[PDB]
Symmetry: D2
Amino acid sequence: SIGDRMKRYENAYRIKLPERMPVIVRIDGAHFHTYTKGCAKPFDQDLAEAFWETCKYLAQNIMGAKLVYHQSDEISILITNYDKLTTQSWFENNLQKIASVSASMATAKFNEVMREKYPDKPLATFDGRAQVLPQDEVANYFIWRQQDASKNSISMVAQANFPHKQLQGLNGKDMQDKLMTEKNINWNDLPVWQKRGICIIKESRWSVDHETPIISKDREYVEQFVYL
Amino acid sequence: SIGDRMKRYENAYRIKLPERMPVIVRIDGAHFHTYTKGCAKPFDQDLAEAFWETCKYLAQNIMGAKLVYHQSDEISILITNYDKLTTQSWFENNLQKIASVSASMATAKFNEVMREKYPDKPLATFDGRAQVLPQDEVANYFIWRQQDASKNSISMVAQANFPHKQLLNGKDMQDKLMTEKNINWNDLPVWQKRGICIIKEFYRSRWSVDHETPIISKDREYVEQFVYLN
Amino acid sequence: SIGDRMKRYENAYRIKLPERMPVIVRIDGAHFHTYTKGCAKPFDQDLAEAFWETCKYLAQNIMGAKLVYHQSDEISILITNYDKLTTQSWFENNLQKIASVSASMATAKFNEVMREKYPDKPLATFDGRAQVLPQDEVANYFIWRQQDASKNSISMVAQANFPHKQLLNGKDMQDKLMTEKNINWNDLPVWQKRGICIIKEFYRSRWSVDHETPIISKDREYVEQFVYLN
Amino acid sequence: SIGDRMKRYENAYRIKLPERMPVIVRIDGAHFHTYTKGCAKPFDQDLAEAFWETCKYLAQNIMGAKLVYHQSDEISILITNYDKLTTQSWFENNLQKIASVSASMATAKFNEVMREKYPDKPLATFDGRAQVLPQDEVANYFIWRQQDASKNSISMVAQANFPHKQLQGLNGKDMQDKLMTEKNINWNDLPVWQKRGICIIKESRWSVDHETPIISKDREYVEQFVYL
Ligand SMILES: Nc1ncnc2c1ncn2[C@@H]1O[C@H](COP(=O)(O)OP(=O)(O)OP(=O)(O)O)[C@@H](O)[C@H]1O
Ligand SMILES: Nc1ncnc2c1ncn2[C@@H]1O[C@H](COP(=O)(O)OP(=O)(O)OP(=O)(O)O)[C@@H](O)[C@H]1O
Ligand SMILES: Nc1ncnc2c1ncn2[C@@H]1O[C@H](COP(=O)(O)OP(=O)(O)OP(=O)(O)O)[C@@H](O)[C@H]1O
Ligand SMILES: Nc1ncnc2c1ncn2[C@@H]1O[C@H](COP(=O)(O)OP(=O)(O)OP(=O)(O)O)[C@@H](O)[C@H]1O
Ligand SMILES: [Mg+2]
Ligand SMILES: [Mg+2]
Ligand SMILES: [Mg+2]
Ligand SMILES: [Mg+2]
Ligand SMILES: [Mg+2]
Ligand SMILES: [Mg+2]
Ligand SMILES: [Mg+2]
Ligand SMILES: [Mg+2]
């Protein structure tokens, strides 16, 4: 049967993630150097709030979603499927389905919210990737993402205040000190989301936590959704 | 370090399709029974033309895109990456990236166009899946899709005329429409009966809707022209 | 170059299991209905002890091997790679390498031992498959294997006494042996009823056959002792 | 059901190769620097013939097998599954099954044949890996394998005739010329299998082709099994 051959051709890449373990989905903006060209540098409040609305929308429509992290143009989602013995998985842990629909959901909401304040902004697109993590690595994943957040934060602030040559090639600590003595800018005084991104947590409703801690010194902020 | 460790967890599902062979991407609307609940049944011209604009947008932005086929709420895209010896692959044939970005692109264009005439419509979403096919199965793929197009076409038309209980198979609902309701399915336009394709047309070049899209099973070269280069 | 191109085709199926989580490898004899056709039915002591020596050989040569379970012609191996923070993975958790080398090792030892007493026996072959499991499913895996061990055990014994047509389920063939043939299944030794495990025993250390291997469903710590390190 | 969960856990890595395209399996000896320590250097006739018997055994028991190539301690097998419209695949193109059983079959036959001439030789083990290739790349695969064969051949001959220091760091052409003027060894005069390995072809029976050509100048030697 032709339908039977095609079904096998399709099933050859019908990958499913193993169940009963943490699933991480990351959604990233495509060509967001071009897309955010024109936005307020180094940090656009309107753009960030559009991401946060997307994070909420994501957390609301994803089965098993427990925690959403945002920084720059990326969105990380922690998904668990082992709350109960009879807990089901989003799309039955189908890899291509989890990744594509997440990117779809993000795309739909982000473009809607952005074009409310910017009706002539070009279309925004996103990619999506899913994976699994052991329980003792979930907190580490977000710690990894927060460290990348701080590294990019400092660079973005130093880029919007100095020519490229000056920064080359300068450490994070250097650009931080140069921001202080030369521009009266104390990086530490910036709001949390600009320094290390923020998390969206269910409080029920999904809301932004502007007091999102440094996860490396408060791992339970993440692990409370990991070990149940 | 921690980043090295994290990089390996991610790479465990960094799947890549083997290169130099036909790639098929299918995009299907999520819960389009609810989303279309309010559209013109059995066939909505506004909704269909929103997919057609989406189909163009996809073909214009996908490296190696040769043909797009639309039917109902699904979009199949034929991608080839062996035109030359130096032909590169879209996202280097990364599985999760090809599927998601395709769904993202489809989502962006579709929602944009649909807002114009239907700003009250909720957000439309899509899923995406990618795969490879041997050269002598590409035509058979679209033939398989057209056969799924016709079976859905007859059911959609019949379910828009008769009651739920009153309606049997495809050959039954076809003559049930001819006799009982005096409606001829074979008289319907091409895109309603077996869907249509989107092909680059030359004049400069542009992606266009071909309403003279043939039955692939009776014209296999229509697809195979993009499958066999040399 | 050509090698770069070839390297990518191969890497399309260079699959790796995610690290820092339980790995299970199962090895199953190929066509062991024919290979064992000539052995002592229902249970052959020589054949079983050849698997036990194979099970030892596997555990001795597999990085992170914690427990091996034998039953019939299958061999399940529990591998952990998270003992320390610096624990490395066998073949870096390469799927095709873990499965094939396991099957190769099993093939080498088994054929060697079996030749000794049965040099007329044809070559024995095995397949191999690897996977991961969450920590709270490892015990459940072996429990699942022991439940498949008992159902096979009763059938093997019954099929060795009665005619093909004469034999119903497990509870039926169990009392059909007690009444009709006066044979008690529950009186049989452990390895025949529910298989056995191979665990490292301390005295120096060595892998040994534990004939006092309990029913895992009634003693989960027997397995979980290797699953949860801290 | 516990059996249903486990089945899903196992199916998470039940990978199948897409059908109706060339499948390549490569089997490689594990630790064959240690295993062949004691064998005749640079080329052991007995060891090579043991490989050839394995290649035959492989070609006889693998559904769809068309061509087997051997060099050093590796075995490459070309498998096709599109001879007819109703052609089936070995193990239904199950990846882990094709790779493991191939390595199993090789292991069984190789150890049997070797221990006929060397009953006290340690056990030999092998790994196995499978993949797909487009039709216009199959000939190139073996060309790639033959080029690696010649590269290793020259090095092995130069290693068994000179100390390590001398070779460092010398081209293939250099070691070839040094073999000539300094040891009266013309590499080109060596038998085919020592220079670039050989193929096992069905002639029916599977037999060694000691006249196996340089595939880069006779691609039809391979492509005759590719395009049918
Ligand atoms: N709040 C913000 N305001 C202004 N710009 C931002 C903001 N957040 C992120 N950006 C911009 O988004 C970009 C992120 O780039 P990234 O490294 O993700 O690659 P990209 O430009 O998105 O392209 P690709 O994702 O295809 O590699 C940065 O250049 C940064 O300037
Ligand atoms: N031109 C059109 N006009 C109106 N409705 C349409 C049109 N094309 C497709 N539809 C509707 O789209 C639906 C497609 O349903 P499908 O089988 O794809 O499942 P779904 O409802 O999309 O949910 P899911 O995709 O999650 O399975 C049909 O019910 C059909 O009524
Ligand atoms: N101790 C033993 N003595 C005799 N025979 C045994 C023993 N253990 C297992 N067997 C035999 O091994 C066979 C196992 O069959 P299994 O269900 O694994 O399929 P198979 O015959 O191995 O073929 P395949 O593995 O290709 O499916 C049984 O038929 C059983 O008779
Ligand atoms: N005919 C032969 N005679 C003597 N030695 C041989 C012969 N064929 C192959 N060898 C030896 O086999 C070895 C092949 O090594 P290879 O690069 O495959 O790694 P390996 O030693 O097999 O270990 P691993 O496969 O685990 O990396 C060479 O060192 C070579 O000396
Ligand atoms: Mg980006
Ligand atoms: Mg980014
Ligand atoms: Mg749909
Ligand atoms: Mg659909
Ligand atoms: Mg078996
Ligand atoms: Mg079995
Ligand atoms: Mg080797
Ligand atoms: Mg080798």
